[PDB]
Design a protein around this ligand. Structure first.
Ligand SMILES: CC1=C(Br)C(=O)C(C(C)C)=C(Br)C1=O
Ligand SMILES: CC1=C(Br)C(=O)C(C(C)C)=C(Br)C1=O
Ligand SMILES: CC1=C(Br)C(=O)C(C(C)C)=C(Br)C1=O
Ligand SMILES: CC1=C(Br)C(=O)C(C(C)C)=C(Br)C1=O
Lengths: 282, 282
């Protein structure tokens, strides 16, 4: 029970084309090949509601022009941009947005597992819609995009979600206790608690018989239910490494040993990851 | 408008009770305090369907006897055990499970974390229900519908989810394209592609201006949508580390720089974590 995926691709290199055709050989994928920018435009504006994912070679003649016209006509669909333009090393993935904010970037040699990248493009578009097109704007603002009616993106997304989404049950984490929603006092409090917990983890990490799994669980629970960005976990790890580095300096010990706790970090993050992963329904 | 949570706390210490009341002071938490084993057993029996979470102080008189009686009378609810039995000899970290398989352990100095750990305890119960009673199994199967009448649990579960669970849309990844479900040939192809990707990540990690982000995102996309566990990513990392070690040797270079690649691992796992974190709806 998985929907067909309507893929349209603007490609003018035969090698790239065949790479795509091979990767997307599964019956699930329906491929439209466009061999020129004008032909791509002609297909898009006449098949506006029949394109699930665009695959666009960035080096193709009049790329920015074609993309800009696409954005102006309101053809903003999930997309994979292959390579870059002949000045910024064409074979390699681009370092900035060319079409829109949910686009994926692939080098010409990262195409063998295209099914998974198509999954990623679709999902990311579904997550970010309405998407900031880096070709419709443009220096104006606005509030700061629009036509307010050009949010047919929403509609597209909705359509897509009927075919590529599925409902499932999740635990109602209280958004008021999310880190990003905490007032200063609470924020500071959670910060200190998480520091204390992580310090327990570090102190007992290399000790035998210490119930490591329990301390780690204690930290990870707070990280998960307060919806803490992984970077903040990293941040805590380093604040602790600083505390210990000062303690070691003062006591005349080498701080090199701190490198070992990189293994702790991995561990913790691993756990956090698996908590999110195993929480995905079905 | 938050769902009310019924907490029953068996505590015979003013300090502990105070910490609990302070941490769970919010209006959604409805606290019932039991100040003896008798009171706990009777309340638990007459209110078996009005307890969402138990909090049990492990140091309490005749603690084991009470928990065993809790099991005998069919009371199996989400739980947090606080401190250790003190019998010999800490008041903090409990090493073994003594009520059931879904219970959480909190130190008596960690009670300020209660709202998050209560969420964790409820969720962990919902995840493992019907849970494994400690005081019932000594074999590799007590357990399942022995007794059948302990479908109470399932009912409890379904009753909790209506107040603590919600429905949301998830992108439907293809299970047949998960790493573990692929035929060994497609499995090999995918493994190889992920190894290649990761090698790019390693080679370009400490290099300036390299498109490390696209590389990492590429890899992570493959890992997420093929639903690989973190152990698999670690596996890949080590397969690449062998290779690089071999190189560093037949070049005279020092291999204490392989240490630095732990950073890489962390990075990658972090990203994967974020990708899972971003995926939770609402
Ligand atoms: C907008 C635009 C134009 Br006019 C163009 O001529 C090219 C060529 C370098 C293929 C590219 Br690459 C491009 O993006
Ligand atoms: C002690 C304490 C901690 Br530690 C804490 O993390 C919070 C909220 C940020 C959940 C609150 Br409020 C609080 O009172
Ligand atoms: C600390 C402690 C120990 Br030593 C013990 O053996 C028991 C049994 C009566 C179950 C319980 Br009751 C208890 O709480
Ligand atoms: C630790 C670990 C976890 Br957690 C896991 O979910 C799996 C497979 C089910 C993908 C595997 Br294999 C594995 O090793």
């Amino acid at each position: 029970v998985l929907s067909q995926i309507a893929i349209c691709i603007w490609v003018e290199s035969t090698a790239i084309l065949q790479d795509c055709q091979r990767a997307l050989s599964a019956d699930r994928y329906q491929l439209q090949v466009c061999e020129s920018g004008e032909m791509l435009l002609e297909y898009a504006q006449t098949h506006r509601d029949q394109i699930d994912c665009l695959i666009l070679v960035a080096a193709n003649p009049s790329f920015r022009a074609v993309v800009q016209q696409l954005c102006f006509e309101g053809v903003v669909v999930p997309a994979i941009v292959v390579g870059d333009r002949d000045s910024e090393d064409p074979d390699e993935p681009a370092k900035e947005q060319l079409y829109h904010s949910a686009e994926l970037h692939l080098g010409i040699h990262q195409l063998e597992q295209l099914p998974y990248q198509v999954d990623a493009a679709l999902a990311e578009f579904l997550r970010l819609a309405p998407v900031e097109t880096m070709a419709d704007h443009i220096m104006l603002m606005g509030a700061n995009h629009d036509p307010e009616l050009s949010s047919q993106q929403r509609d597209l997304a909705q359509r897509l979600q009927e075919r590529l989404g599925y409902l499932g049950v999740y635990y109602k984490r209280d958004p008021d206790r999310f880190l990003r929603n905490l007032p200063a006092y609470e924020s500071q409090k959670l910060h200190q608690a998480m520091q204390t917990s992580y310090r327990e983890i570090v102190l007992s990490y290399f000790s035998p018989n210490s119930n490591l799994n329990q301390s780690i669980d204690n930290f990870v629970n707070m990280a998960f239910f307060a919806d803490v960005p992984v970077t903040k976990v990293v941040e805590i790890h380093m604040e602790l490494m600083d505390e210990f580095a000062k303690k070691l300096r003062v006591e005349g010990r080498s701080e090199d040993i701190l490198l070992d706790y990189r293994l702790t970090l991995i561990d913790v993050i691993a756990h956090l990851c698996e908590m999110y992963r195993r929480s995905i329904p079905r």
